[PDB]
Amino acid sequence: SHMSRKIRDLIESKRFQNVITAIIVLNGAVLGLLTDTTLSASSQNLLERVDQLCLTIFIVEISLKIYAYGVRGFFRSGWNLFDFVIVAIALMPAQGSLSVLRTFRIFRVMRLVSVIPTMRRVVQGMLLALPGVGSVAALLTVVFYIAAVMATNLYGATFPEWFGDLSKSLYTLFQVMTLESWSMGIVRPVMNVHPNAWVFFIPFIMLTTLTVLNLFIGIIVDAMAITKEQEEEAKTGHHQEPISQTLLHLGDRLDRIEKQLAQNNELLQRQ
């Protein structure tokens, strides 16, 4: 229709993005002021209404989009669904789920990612890089589970605060992996009772730090290449051959042209 044609161009305008961005920043700034308990009852009521104002502008924004794109058209984008859920959850009447409350209204500032395209790209590259490190992430999960069971059996009776159960052991092994007081706080005290405890903890540190670095480098290198590759697909409109494919086949492509040159030289030398 005509009403669903200008609205899309209003939605796609730089100023509309900037207006929404300004309202996200504003909502975020009022939620930060609401952390101050010394504020007067009138100041709290004022900011709570600016929060209500900000939220209503997001209901108008999402409705404008659902109409101008359609239910199937809007929910076709993962970013729009995320934007929908962020706003729709604020109007959820006693939602049934394992948690505590929804005071986490500050997760509305996470919309700065979906609304700013330079930031949307960064998060997109990182998210697209996750499936590819699933195996490394699972190997790290296996090492933690094996280690947690071993630590609970070995040290739980003598160190119940740190290794009393599986939960306690996963928490202190995560601390050990982060190298946080691993020796002065955990292993030297454990070695006073179990002198060969270093046989367990030093290999655990060696293995988990390498794996977590592997996981992190893997995510970073992939996210960087995916982003670069997507920017090129956006600029030209043509599909970008991933760099790994270009590098894997560089040898094959060079020898083929070397051979095609030699046969063109053979037909040339004898004419």
Add this chain to the structure above:
Amino acid sequence: SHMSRKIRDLIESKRFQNVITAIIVLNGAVLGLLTDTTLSASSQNLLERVDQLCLTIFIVEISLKIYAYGVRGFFRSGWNLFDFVIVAIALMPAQGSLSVLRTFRIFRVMRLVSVIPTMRRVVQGMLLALPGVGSVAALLTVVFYIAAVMATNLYGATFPEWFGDLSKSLYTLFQVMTLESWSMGIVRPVMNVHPNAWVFFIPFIMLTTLTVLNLFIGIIVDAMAITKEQEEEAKTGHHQEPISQTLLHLGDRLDRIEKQLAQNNELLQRQ
């Protein structure tokens, strides 16, 4: 034979892998529940039998493989030998070795690596990357030994808990390398007695952190390329020229084709 033909296809089926995977997870989950000492005698006896059930399924699995592939055929794979040793050790009657016990039945969860091919590849790439960092690993071992001897001679009489002997010094130098309370916990106290101790510990930290990072980056970069190269060899069936060789000879290959072009141009300009 006919009996050693369908069994191989049963062994190679996705559902058989999934059945074994489910039994590994199950065994791992019952071993984790067995860390809880508050459980009733009947609950402990129940889970211990589910452990026996899981173990028997692995004996049937390995036997099925040894028959369908042969002794020489099965033990030709490093992964199958690993799978054999994991299961066979659970039936080892008082094995003679320097240790304590075999309560580490949880190392059976490490079979998730050998049974899941996406995880088998990750560990394979990492293991194939180790011989190549042997020299860096040995340099780190030399620096630790020299440092341990120096620290024992310099500080062992005044700081016996940390440097009293070689073992004690290797342990606290490893802690120092991990930057764990290196200054507030070790070096500021040591400097109160030996004021120039920083001349020993600051260069030691500078050298070992660079070397350990070198070792780790070396493993990660190699494991990533080896995996990528093996996936390409698996996809096409052709041997993949390692990227280092492609990069080292990129210059040579380009100038050769440049020259072959210039000589083809020379025969063309004068015909």
Add this chain to the structure above:
Amino acid sequence: SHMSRKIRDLIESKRFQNVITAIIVLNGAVLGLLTDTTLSASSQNLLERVDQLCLTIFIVEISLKIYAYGVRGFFRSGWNLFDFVIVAIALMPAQGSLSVLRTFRIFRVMRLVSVIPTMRRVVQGMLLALPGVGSVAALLTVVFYIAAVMATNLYGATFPEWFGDLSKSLYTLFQVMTLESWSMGIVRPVMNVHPNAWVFFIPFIMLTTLTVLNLFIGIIVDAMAITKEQEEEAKTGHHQEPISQTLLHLGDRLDRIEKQLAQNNELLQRQ
């Protein structure tokens, strides 16, 4: 003019650079000696005059440059403007700004960067690499703000020293991100009152360490390539195609020449 021709060649001479370098080192060395409060009143007065001498040589240096290049010519370089501001601020009479004093005369040693070209290049590569990581830096800023608001609401009433307000929470979240006593000092004490606090802090650590590593790797890789690319532009005088462009179009360029070879082969086989 003739007076603004030899001065430029004096300014561009290796010995003039070395003379200025020697005066920066000298000024830096006297400012370091002036940190010693045990010095006699005559020794303090002596060094304070060597500081005055060093400062005057920089006024002569900058004036020499402004004359030999012109106001528009001198201030056309970001490095010269930096050099101008460093020297000009020492003669600022009670400048109006939010601070405390200008005792930070030691920021004059930062001129070793602008005066030594090998060091000017390093800092240049790093500075040119910053706009490109602005989105990652902003994502990290968003995560910190959301987390600070959450931590203030959740823990500020029970842990006011660490989370009492927004400022306090940003400071302890930065400490948590650096892994400094995150568990023994902050989270184990917080968990004694709020047992599921690990649900907040472990994901926060996981997310911020990956993002800060991403930010850092991004800066390092870019600064390294920018420097390499600028050295090549300086050596040849020709514009250097950035490596990302060379890599993105490597596939396209190889298939195009492959096709141009095949069509040259087609005209050759049938002549």
Add this chain to the structure above:
Amino acid sequence: SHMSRKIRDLIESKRFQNVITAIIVLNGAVLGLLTDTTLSASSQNLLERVDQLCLTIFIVEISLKIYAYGVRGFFRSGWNLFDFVIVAIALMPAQGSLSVLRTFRIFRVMRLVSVIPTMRRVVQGMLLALPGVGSVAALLTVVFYIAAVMATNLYGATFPEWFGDLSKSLYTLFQVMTLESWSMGIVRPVMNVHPNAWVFFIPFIMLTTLTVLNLFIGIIVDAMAITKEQEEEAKTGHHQEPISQTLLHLGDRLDRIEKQLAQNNELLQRQ
């Protein structure tokens, strides 16, 4: 001569290298046993003689080399000079230098690097990578000096143990850069007296961690490429074009051959 022909081939034999390697390990193992103060006077005298035996074998080894290569020929290699100095210093009668003693006989184990070629290559690549990071290393040195002077002036009167003088401040800034108790141990106590101290320490941490990572990544990436490039020069005998040069000129080389193809196509289409 004939006597200086077979000795060189004896010196270059795998077994001679292995004999020297075995004597280095042996000397290192006896020096490690000599750290144990509980040993009997006869055991100490025994090991001290095995040290004398090991040292004499190195005097015979070096003399054998100086004769078989010549004074100019032997001292032409940096590795041989290092090997000469390690052995010659053990016979230095009260050498005049600023130190304490030469009990550091364990630095003789550092010969395992010069004697094992796979380890000699690793250290060689690392040493050749140092001149290239000199500017980054100097930038880090400048930041530390500026920071040390600032910290001494700002905090030395109120925190004399940590910032009382320049030496004290460089030591605690190095600790701060390593993130070792930077907040719970240094900055939270400093902020109790100087509440805006975080304005100094948080930027200092941000800047030095990025620079030290830059320095380290720079060394690692260069050492890896230098080693790879030297192995190729050793294998073929031909000079290896450094990868940076191959990558910088990849664009130029591809467009040149693209143009040479188009002109060969132009002469072909009209014959």
